Amino acid sequence: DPMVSKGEELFTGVVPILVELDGDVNGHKFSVSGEGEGDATYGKLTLKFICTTGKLPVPWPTLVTTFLMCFARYPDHMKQHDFFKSAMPEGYVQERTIFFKDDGNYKTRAEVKFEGDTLVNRIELKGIDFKEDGNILGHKLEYNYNSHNVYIMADKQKNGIKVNFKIRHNIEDGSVQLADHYQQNTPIGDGPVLLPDNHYLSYQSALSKDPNEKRDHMVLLEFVTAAGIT
């Protein structure tokens, strides 16, 4: 299927990634740069994020979902349902509202596209209504991350997809801070895209630190595999 081919030839081996984020959460301004590489054959992303403006005013874990669904490993039987690679190289927009239960919300707007050989994720993030002393602005979340499944459905009237899912962030006391994610993606180009049957992506995420890095930063290893169409 030459539409499948177009995605395969773009994603074949290891593809460099650049991420750039501009953020304002309750008027705490910050910027994050990330670099690393994706290997869609294995659903594998390896990334290091640096807060280039100093101390990151929110917990690193709360930005993980915002910081590349095009690197998902779609099994062979599901390749006709991979919207994300089908929109490349021109790319897609990914927008979210992330509601932190009993606290504020993030609103994010991203553009994911090729710039030459490099796959780039340009993000603006606005956080409003956060509590001073709450789990987010008060840095009360643990530096770890749970596995979650993300359910993708077509958003046919918009030629794109929509996704709704819950992330549970462990709080330092043993409890959990729920982050309800609403998401919409639309292609940037005029070209056709693959609109998927309902299915999910299965995420595994591991957070670490560069022992040689003095800046405020996050090392992120993620594995992402499509499933749920047998």
Curated annotation (Swiss-Prot):
Keyword Ribosomal protein in record: no
Effect on the protein of changing F67L: In EGFP; increases fluorescence at warmer temperatures such as 37 degrees Celsius. In EBFP; gives rise to variants with blue fluorescence
This protein's UniProt keywords: Chromophore, Luminescence, Photoprotein
InterPro entries for this protein: GFP (IPR009017), GFP-related (IPR011584), Green_fluorescent_prot (IPR000786)
Annotated consequence of substituting I167T: In P11; increases fluorescence at 475 nm excitation and at warmer temperatures such as 37 degrees Celsius. In Esmerald; leads to brighter fluorescence. In VisGreen; leads to brighter fluorescence
Consequence of changing N105T: In EBFP1.2; shifts the excitation and emission spectra to shorter wavelengths and increases quantum yields compared to BFP
Outcome when changing S33R: In mut1.28; shifts fluorescence lifetime from 3.03 to 2.76 ns. In mut2.2; shifts fluorescence lifetime from 3.03 to 1.94 ns. In mut3.3; shifts fluorescence lifetime from 3.03 to 1.88 ns
Mod. after translation: Contains a chromophore consisting of modified amino acid residues. Maturation of the chromophore requires nothing other than molecular oxygen.
Effect of V176A: In mut2.1; shifts fluorescence lifetime from 3.03 to 2.50 ns
Reported impact of I128V: In EBFP2.0; shifts the excitation and emission spectra to shorter wavelengths and increases quantum yields compared to BFP
Effect of H148D: In Cerulean; leads to improved quantum yield, a higher extinction coefficient and is 2.5-fold brighter than ECFP
Mutation effect (S175G): In GFPA; leads to enhanced fluorescence at 37 degrees Celsius. In Venus; leads to yellow fluorescence, improved maturation and reduced environmental sensitivity
Coiled coil: none
Effect on the protein of changing S147P: Increases fluorescence at warmer temperatures such as 37 degrees Celsius
Effect of M153T: Increases fluorescence at warmer temperatures such as 37 degrees Celsius
Subunit structure as annotated in this protein's UniProt entry: Monomer.
Function per UniProt: Energy-transfer acceptor. Its role is to transduce the blue chemiluminescence of the protein aequorin into green fluorescent light by energy transfer. Fluoresces in vivo upon receiving energy from the Ca(2+)-activated photoprotein aequorin.
Family membership: Belongs to the GFP family.
Protein name per Swiss-Prot or TrEMBL: Green fluorescent protein
